[PDB]
Amino acid sequence: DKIPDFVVPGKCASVTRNKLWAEQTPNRNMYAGVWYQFALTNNPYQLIEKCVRNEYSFDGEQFVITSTGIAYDGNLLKRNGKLYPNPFGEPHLSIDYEMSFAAPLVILETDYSNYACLYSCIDYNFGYHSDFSFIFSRSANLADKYVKKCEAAFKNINVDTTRFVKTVQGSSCPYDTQKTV
Amino acid sequence: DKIPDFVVPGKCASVTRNKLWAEQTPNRNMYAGVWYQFALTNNPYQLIEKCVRNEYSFDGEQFVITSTGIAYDGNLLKRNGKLYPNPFGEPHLSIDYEMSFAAPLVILETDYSNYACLYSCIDYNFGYHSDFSFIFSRSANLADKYVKKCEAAFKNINVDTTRFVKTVQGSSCPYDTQKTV
Ligand code: NA
Ligand code: NA
Ligand code: NA
C-alpha cells in the first residue's frame, strides 16, 4: 500500500469524548456563526476547494449549516449540512452533508471566539481506520497562538500534523457574494 | 498502486432513483421482519462476517434495525442501526449504525418476501467511487431465480457481479442466541 495517507493502522484513537461533550454542551450556542476552514487533512469528500466559509445556525439542540466557496472547477458552490447529536446516544455529533454521508465529528478543542479543532474517525474491519481533521477559524487567518493549540491537540491523539493542507482564504475570496449563496 | 476492488475510477452510476420509489414500493406496508445477508461485495465497514441477520421494526418514519451474527474475531456481535429518508430530502435513504456512520442506500429491487437487492455508492473528489452491494433473503437459502434477478439489476448499473461473496448462513448459525441479542 503506497496510498492513502488517510488510512491509518490501529483503531480510532481515544479522545475522552464524554469530557469534551460535558464541557462543550453548555456553550454549544457560541459555536454558532461563521467559521472559515483554515486547514484540513486530506479529504475525498470535500467539494469546496477554496474560500471555505461555514455558516452555522443553532436551534437549541442541533445545527444547520450553509457551506460556501469556490469548487474545484473554479465556480461558486453551496453545500447544505447538519450537525446534531449521535442518533444512538454516543457522546459525539454527526456531521451530515447533501450528496454525502454522516460521519462522527468531535470537537477536540475550541475557544468559540477564535478557533476550533475538529476530528472525524471511522474504523474498518481489518484493524485500520481513516480520519479527517480540520482547523476552523473565526477569521480568514488564524494566529500562531491558535494554530499551536490545534497542533498540540492533534499531536495528542497522534494525528500526523504534517498531513494538514492550508486552505485558500483572504481578500481574493468573494465572501460578500458567498453570503447571498 | 494496489487498489481495492471497491474503489473504482469514475462517478457513481446514475440509477433513476425516482423510478425505484415507484417500482420496489410495496402494495401494502411492511412494518416488521428479518432479512439475512445472502451475499455482499467486499466491504471494509461490515463488522459481522458470518450469520448476518437483520431484524427491523418500524416507528414513525425510521426502521429500527438489529444486526447480529458472528464477528471476524469469532465472537457474537450485535449492532444497532436506523433507516430513514435522506435528511436533505434526496430521493434515497440513510442507513445509520452505532459506532459507524450513515451511508446512502437504495433498494435496487425486491419482492418483499423472497429477496432484496441493495446498493450504496458515494463519490470521491479525486475521480473514484466506492459502492457496496447486498443481496438479502428471508431465509438462509435463496432460489437461483432470485439471485439472477439481483444479478441483472446490478449488471444493469454496471456493477461487476463477480464481486459478490456468499455469506455463511444456515443451521450452523447460532440464530437463537442472536435473537437474545
Ligand atoms: Na484525512
Ligand atoms: Na466569524
Ligand atoms: Na409506525
UniProtKB/Swiss-Prot annotation, chains A, B:
One of its GO terms (biological process) is lipid metabolic process. This is Crustacyanin-C1 subunit. The keyword Endoplasmic reticulum does not apply. It is found in: Secreted, Extracellular space. Binds the carotenoid astaxanthin (AXT) which provides the blue coloration to the carapace of the lobster. One of its GO terms (molecular function) is pigment binding. It comes from Homarus gammarus (European lobster). Disulfide bonds join C12-C121, C51-C173, C117-C150. Keywords: Disulfide bond, Pigment, Secreted, Transport. Its main location: secreted.
